Amino acid sequence: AFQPKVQSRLVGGSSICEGTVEVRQGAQWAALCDSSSARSSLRWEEVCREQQCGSVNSYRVLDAGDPTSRGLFCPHQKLSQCHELWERNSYCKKVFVTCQD
């Protein structure tokens, strides 16, 4: 196994356990684009736990319908299943996540 790890962090929160999700894999931090059609709390529970911030309490989407937003895209269900990130250079929908603590 042992493949490199997509890292995640939350920026701009009113605390360190909430904020807009960014990812890096080898590096350059950028907003995570999420292109799921049903909303699932599965990724955000992983992100919150990885921040050591406990469970996810809520999440919301940002930048819906902005053809100019850009960030980095993971084509698998869980970030911990990605070992590689692609640029998405238009229509990046991002996610603001609020963790437990």
Swiss-Prot record:
Residues 8-100 form the SRCR domain. Disulfide bonds join C17-C53, C33-C92, C48-C99, C74-C82. Phosphorylated on serine, threonine and tyrosine residues following TCR stimulation. It is found in: Cell membrane. It comes from the Eukaryota. Interacts with CD72/LYB-2. Interacts with PTPN6/SHP-1. Interacts with CBL. Interacts with CD5L. Interacts with CD3Z/CD247. Lymphoid-specific receptor expressed by all T-cells and in a subset of B-cells known as B1a cells. Plays a role in the regulation of TCR and BCR signaling, thymocyte selection, T-cell effector differentiation and immune tolerance. Acts by interacting with several ligands expressed on B-cells such as CD5L or CD72 and thereby plays an important role in contact-mediated, T-dependent B-cell activation and in the maintenance of regulatory T and B-cell homeostasis. This is T-cell surface glycoprotein CD5. It comes from Homo sapiens. The gene is CD5. The chain holds residues 269 to 369 of 495 of the full protein.
